[PDB]
């Protein structure tokens, strides 16, 4: 086509989606990670995660308002990944890298799994 | 913070949100523009438009499944802007620029209004 493109549009959209999440506006699901609960938008979770994409395209699970993750999932690792979904920024630290990588593998977030593998390899 | 950032994350999110729109997955509103209907996600519309942001934060309108736009709104101009919301690409042409700018003014999409004003000024 002969379209023009606004460079900052995708980033501006994601910033506003994070503002709606922070104010709990039109969030339609709560993700339960052991004792912890995280409110989010199903569409953003699907857009970022192979696991959530599979869950919310399922004809029965698409209608659930609560999703319980596997008890081995670390709430902090999930929190870091949820923040990444809504911001593009990943708070990867020596103290959380193992939990973040395991959570990213479970959530099927391949780019995160890739940077975790590389950061771990450099420390070996 | 000491976060790392994935450059293509926002664009990849928007691409997947457009794929969900194309397959009519988790769309939660229909925008009526005279004889034409457009299915979308309320969160994406709010993230792109000052008008939709105001509509869907209203305590009664937030729950509507159908929104009727002003009868002066051109369906093609709306279609072009909805495509822009989900892709960052604007199909701006001599034959549609007036309708696109008027629709962008109504929808409160300031960056679109700005490029339309500039493209019109160059042709004068």
């Amino acid at each position: 086509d002969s379209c023009i493109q606004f460079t900052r549009h995708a980033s501006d959209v994601l910033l506003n989606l994070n503002r709606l999440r922070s104010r709990d506006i039109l969030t339609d699901v709560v993700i339960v990670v052991s004792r912890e609960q995280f409110r989010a938008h199903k569409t953003v979770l699907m857009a970022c995660s192979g696991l959530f994409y599979s869950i919310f395209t399922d004809q029965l699970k698409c209608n659930l308002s609560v999703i319980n993750l596997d008890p081995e999932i670390n709430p902090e690792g999930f929190c870091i990944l949820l923040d990444f979904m809504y911001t593009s920024r990943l708070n990867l630290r020596e103290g959380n890298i193992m939990a973040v990588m395991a959570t990213a593998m479970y959530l099927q977030m391949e780019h995160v799994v890739d940077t975790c593998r590389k950061f771990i390899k450099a420390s070996e | 913070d000491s976060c790392i950032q994935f450059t293509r994350h926002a664009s990849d999110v928007l691409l997947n949100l457009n794929r969900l729109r194309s397959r009519d997955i988790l769309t939660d509103v229909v925008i009526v523009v005279s004889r034409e209907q457009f299915r979308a996600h309320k969160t994406v519309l709010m993230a792109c438009s000052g008008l939709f942001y105001s509509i869907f934060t209203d305590q009664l309108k937030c729950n509507l499944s159908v929104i009727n736009l002003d009868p002066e709104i051109n369906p093609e101009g709306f279609c072009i802007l909805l495509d822009f919301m989900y892709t960052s690409r604007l199909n701006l042409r001599e034959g549609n620029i007036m309708a696109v700018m008027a629709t962008a003014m109504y929808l409160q999409m300031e960056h679109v209004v700005d490029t339309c004003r500039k493209f019109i000024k160059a042709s004068e």
């Binding site: 379209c3 023009i4 493109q5 606004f6 | 690409r89 490029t115």
Partner: peptide
């Protein structure tokens, strides 16, 4: 705005 750019030519993509």
């Amino acid at each position: 705005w750019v030519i993509p």
